[PDB]
Design a binder for this molecule. Structure first.
Ligand SMILES: CCc1oc2ccccc2c1C(=O)c1cc(Br)c(O)c(Br)c1
Length: 515
């Protein structure tokens, strides 16, 4: 009397699973908002150096002559690479000579310019305040944003590991609801810190709790349903991320202050926590540990929801004990890691699998967090990524049976990569075509994640099937951390970050055909 018999006899498809799927997919949207808020809360607006002549009204009253704002801006600030006033320099001694056109204003030495020691001036047309405006992440401090994003992703990884151990030892629902509470508390606290390091630490905690809640939601959604309806729930979970993208765009358009935006994003998790208590605990894990009475109570409850009390009556403790006896043992999990790499037949498939996992995190998170440089309307670009993803994710499922198994991975990585590499070659004059290629590039990478999850299981044997999938997750998380740090290469040239973000997926796709 295995557990699947009990799950089928109490009802696997009836009602209850739909309600549980809704209640566990709703928080995924806000999980996505928390993950991708860093694009909007930390946007860098156009800035110019602070000038006593222009900004200070006391010096404004002392100006001899009614000089226009553009004239004074040209007098005070050297021109920049894009014919705009330069961001990080200022004339120490106001140059009245530059106004006259009889002198070619080209012989300016760096010794005549000094760093902006009196602050900066930011435009507030599109954003009222970001962390860059608040803590002056400009010039010499421009490299700290990728550090913050990498800290967030490392927090995701550490939280995933810690919550894995905690859910293995204590259960699913308890860790899930405590993750809800910790998300809410940590976000609310982070929305009020005065200094940058405290903000980074509390974002680290938020990321840890987000990883925990995502993993526990996935596990609970998978475990309470029969194997026949698993892919439908996985597809719903995948669509949850696109809906979260759309929600992130809408909410970021709604609120233009980073503190208020963070508070609004972190608020609904308390409402999730308050009702998370009513959710039934997973019966299989309760059977595994040995709390037969609690598992029987949950089984009776869930069968009562399915309006199947007549079949629910005959459940007995001895059947539960037999099911516990029939549970497979996890002792061999220690040696499953070694046999993946030591076996030559298994070694080559793992390396190809890891590269596919690695390419997704490295490419997507290095670009999905940098929509500022890919276009002007960040609000429209954020929503379009979610919108384009849905047709591609569903369309890729149909493509599986027709063109075969092997060709799927290569096509799902080469095409998104080539679009990114085509971004450089397109002239900057055509902005409409320039932005469209980037949208299709990152938008199509969503089908890559969905494909690899299904693909990895079927290759490996059932004995080590679970372990191999876990290794791919670690590589994807590890590749995410290295993503934002690539943007530091932009000082050499603007095309350098895009070349790495395009070349890497292509090689991963081209090496994927050898499986
Ligand atoms: C925003 C969700 C998320 O944040 C992470 C941080 C570190 C490693 C993985 C993730 C991760 C995913 O797994 C993921 C999976 C699928 Br399928 C998607 O279509 C999108 Br979009 C994201």
């Amino acid at each position: 009397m295995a557990f699947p018999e009990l799950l089928d006899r109490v009802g696997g498809r009836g009602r209850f699973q739909l309600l549980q799927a809704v209640a566990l997919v709703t928080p995924i949207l806000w999980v996505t908002t928390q993950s991708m808020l860093e694009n909007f809360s930390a946007a860098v607006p156009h800035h110019r150096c602070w000038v006593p002549l222009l900004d200070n009204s006391t010096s404004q009253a002392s100006i001899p002559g009614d000089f226009g704002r553009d004239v004074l801006l040209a007098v005070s600030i050297p021109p920049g690479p894009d014919q705009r006033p330069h961001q990080c320099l200022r004339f120490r001694q106001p140059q009245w000579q530059l106004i006259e056109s009889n002198t070619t204003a080209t012989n300016w030495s760096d010794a005549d310019t000094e760093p902006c020691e009196d602050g900066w001036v930011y435009d507030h047309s599109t954003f009222r305040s970001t962390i860059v405006t608040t803590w002056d992440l400009v010039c010499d401090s421009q490299a700290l944003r990728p550090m913050a994003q990498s800290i967030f992703l490392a927090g995701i990884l550490v939280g995933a590991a810690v919550c894995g151990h905690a859910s293995d030892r204590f259960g699913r629902r308890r860790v899930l609801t405590w993750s809800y509470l910790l998300v809410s508390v940590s976000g609310t606290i982070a929305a009020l810190m005065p200094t940058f390091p405290l903000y980074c630490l509390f974002r680290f905690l938020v990321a840890s709790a987000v990883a925990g809640v995502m993993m526990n939601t996935a596990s609970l959604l998978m475990e309470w349903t029969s194997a026949q309806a698993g892919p439908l729930m996985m597809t719903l979970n995948a669509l949850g991320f696109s809906f979260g993208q759309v929600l992130t765009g809408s909410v970021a358009y709604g609120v233009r202050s980073w503190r208020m935006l963070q508070l609004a994003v972190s608020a609904p998790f308390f409402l999730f926590f308050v009702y998370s208590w009513w959710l039934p605990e997973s019966a299989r894990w309760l059977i595994t540990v040995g709390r037969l009475d609690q598992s029987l109570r949950e089984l009776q409850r869930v069968a009562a929801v399915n309006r199947r009390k007549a079949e629910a009556d005959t459940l007995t403790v001895e059947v539960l004990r037999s099911a516990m006896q029939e549970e497979p043992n996890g002792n061999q999990a220690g040696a499953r890691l070694g046999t993946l790499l030591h076996t030559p037949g298994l070694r080559l498939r793992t390396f190809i699998s890891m590269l596919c996992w690695f390419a997704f995190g490295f490419t997507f998170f290095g670009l999905a967090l940098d929509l500022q440089a890919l276009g002007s309307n960040i609000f429209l670009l954020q929503a379009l990524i979610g919108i384009v993803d849905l047709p591609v994710k569903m369309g890729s499922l149909l493509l599986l049976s027709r063109l075969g198994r092997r060709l799927c991975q290569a096509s799902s990585l080469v095409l998104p990569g080539l679009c990114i590499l085509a971004n450089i070659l397109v002239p900057r004059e055509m902005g409409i075509l320039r932005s469209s290629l980037a949208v299709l590039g990152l938008g199509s990478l969503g089908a890559a994640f969905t494909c690899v999850t299904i693909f990895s299981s079927e290759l490996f044997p059932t004995v080590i099937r679970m372990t191999a999938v876990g290794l791919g997750q670690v590589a994807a998380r590890g590749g995410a951390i290295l993503g934002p740090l690539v943007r530091l290469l932009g000082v050499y040239g603007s095309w350098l970050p895009l070349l790495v973000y395009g070349v890497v997926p292509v090689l991963s796709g081209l090496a994927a055909l050898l499986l």
